Amino acid sequence: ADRHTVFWNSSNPKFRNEDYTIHVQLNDYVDIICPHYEDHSVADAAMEQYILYLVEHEEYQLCQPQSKDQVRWQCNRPSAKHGPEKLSEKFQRFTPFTLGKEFKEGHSYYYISKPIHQHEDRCLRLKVTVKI
Amino acid sequence: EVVLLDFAAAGGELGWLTHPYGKGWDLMQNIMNDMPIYMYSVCNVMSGDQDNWLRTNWVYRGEAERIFIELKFTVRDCNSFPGGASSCKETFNLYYAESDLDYGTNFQKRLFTKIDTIAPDEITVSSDFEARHVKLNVEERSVGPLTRKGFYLAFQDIGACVALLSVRVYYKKC
C-alpha cells in the first residue's frame, strides 16, 4: 500500500493549528512514529511519551477519550535501541479481530493523544479521511 | 515442556515471511486486556483466488523428535459480511517442512507437507463486534518423528478472515 508517515511529537509543526489531516485510500497504512531520542541528547524527564486513542468525532473535538476502551497504542519507549516505537494501522474495510477498527471509503476517523510526560499543555490530534 | 517457538512471547520482535509479498497476511497491533499484542491477520474474503502463505522462521530441532504445535486464532463467519462474500472461507491450512539448512527468503511451497485443515470451534459473528467479544480458538496438533536439523511451519489462507495471535511449538521431556 501507499504508507503515510505521521511523526507524533509536539515539535512537528503539522500539529500546530490542531487541524492536521491526512487523506488515504482504503488499504493504505498510516505509520504513526512515536517520539524517539538518541541516548544522551535530552534529559529523561524532557522525553515525550503518549497514550494514543482512536476515537469518534465528538472525542476528537473535545480532545478527550470517552473511555479506556479507545486506547489504541502507547508511545512508552522513547529511547528504544532499535528506533522509534511505531503504530502501523492498516485502513482495511474488514477485521477478524473484534477489538480492532474497520475503515470505510468516504468516511473520516480520528486519533488523539494524552501525554504521559504529562503536563497536558496542548492538544495533539489527527483526522484521517478515506477516499472513495 | 521445552518451548522451541512462541510468537506471542516475542512481543512483536519476530517477523515471518509472507507470500506473495504485500498481499495477504499482515502484522497488526492491538490492545487486549490492557496489554499490547501483535497478530498476523488476513481477510481477503471478497476477491477471487487467494493463496496467501505465512511461514515461520527456521526452528532448530535439537533433540526434539515429536513437536506439539498450539495455535490460538479468531475466524470470522462468512455470513457476517454485508456483501455475502461468495469467495469466503472459514478454514485455513497448517503445514510444516524439515530441512538441514535455512532457505531464508527462498520460500518454496512444494517443500511443505500439510498437517491439517484447521477450523474454528467458535466462529466470530456480527454481534461480537458490538459486544467487543473475543472468541479465541485453541487447536493443537503434533508432528514427528523429526530427523533434520530444523523445520518451518506455514499457514496458508485461501480466502478466510483470520487472526493468528499465538503459535507455540514445544516438546515434552519425560
- B174: closest CA of chain A, how far (Å): 38
Closest-CA distance of chain B to residue A81, Å: 12
Distance CA B59, CA B102 (A): 9
Evaluate whether B105 touches B147 at the Cβ level (below 8 Å): no
Neighboring chain B residues of A92 at a CB cutoff of 8 Å: 43
Residue matched to cell numbers 510468537: B7
Specify the pairing of strand A3-7 against strand A29-33: parallel
Q: What distance in Å separates the CA atoms of residue A101 and residue A130, rounded to the nearest whole number? A: 13
Chain B residues within an 8 Å CB radius of A73: 29, 31, 36
Give the span between the Cα atoms of B28 and B38, in whole angstroms.
6
C-alpha cell at A99: 477489538
Chain A residues within 8 A of B162 when measuring between CB atoms: 96
Length reported for chain A:
132
- Rounded CA gap, B157 and B160, in Å? 6
Instruction: Give the integer Cα–Cα distance in Å for B93 and A108.
Output: 36
A70 touches chain B (CB under 8 A): no
Q: How was this structure determined?
A: X-ray
How many whole angstroms separate alpha carbon B149 and alpha carbon B102? Answer: 9
Q: Which residue segments constitute the domains of chain A, with CATH numbers given?
A: 1-132 (2.60.40.420)
Provide the phi-psi class of B100: left if phi over 0, else alpha when psi is between -120 and 50, else beta.
alpha
Looking at chain A, list the stretches that DSSP marks H as alpha helix, in order from N- to C-terminal side: 57-62
- Residue in B27, B74, B133 closest to A96 by CB: B74
Measure CB to CB from residue B43 to each of A71, A88, A94 and give the nearest one. Answer: A94
Contacts of A71 in chain B (CB under 8 A): 31, 34
Fold of B1-174: Jelly Rolls (2.60.120)
d(CA A112, CA A87): 13
Q: Which of chain B's residues have a Cβ under 8 Å away from the Cβ of A74?
A: 36
Amino acid at B125: V
Q: Residues near B84 by Cβ (< 8 Å), separated by ≥ 6?
A: none
Give Cα B89 to chain centroid, integer Å: 15
Q: Which H, E and C letters describe chain B, residue by residue?
A: CEEEEECHHHCCCCCCEEECCCCCCEEEEEEECCEEEEEEEECCCCCCCCCEEEECCCEECCCCCCEEEEEEEEEECHHHCCCCCCCCECCEEEEEEEECCCCCCCCCHHHCEEEEEECCCCCECHHHHHCCCCCCEEEEEEECCCCCCEEEEEEEECCECEEEEEEEEEECCC
Amino acid at A36: H
* Single-letter residue type at B35: M
CA distance linking residue B119 with residue B104, whole number of Å: 29
- Inform me whether the C-beta atom of residue A77 falls under 8 Å from chain B C-beta atoms: no
Mutate to test the interface with B, among A70, A98, A103 (most CBs of B within 10 A): A98
Amino acid type, A13: P
Residue B125 and residue B80 in contact, taking contact as beta carbons nearer than 8 Å = yes
For chain A, the first-to-last Cα distance in angstroms comes to 15
The residue among A29, A99, A109, A112 whose CA lies nearest residue B37 is A99
Q: Which residue of A68, A73, A98 is in closest CB contact with B29? A: A73
Size of interface A-B (CB pairs under 8 A): 60
- The three three-digit cell numbers of residue B84, written as one number: 455475502
Instruction: Say yes or no: A32 contacts chain B, CB-CB below 8 A.
Output: no
Give the separation between CA A36 and CA A47, rounded to whole angstroms: 8
User: Is-contact A53 A112, C-beta < 8 A?
Assistant: yes
- Distance, in Å, from the CA atom of A26 to the CA atom of A90, rounded to the nearest integer, reads 8
Resolution of the experimental structure, in angstroms: 2.0
Query: How close B129 comes to chain A (CA, Å)?
Result: 5
Quick one: cell of B169? 511449538
Pairwise CB contact (< 8 Å): A72 & B163: no
What residues are paired with B31 via a beta bridge? Answer: B36
Omega before B20 cis (within 30°)? yes
- Asked whether B158 and B62 are in contact (CB, 8 A), the reply is no
Residues near A119 by beta carbon (within 8 Å), at least 6 away in sequence: none
Cα(A100)–Cα(A28) distance, integer angstroms: 16
**CA-based angle B74:B80:B84, to the nearest 5?**
125
Q: What cell was used for B170? A: 514445544
**Residues 6+ positions from A15 with CB-CB distance below 8 Å:** A124, A125, A126
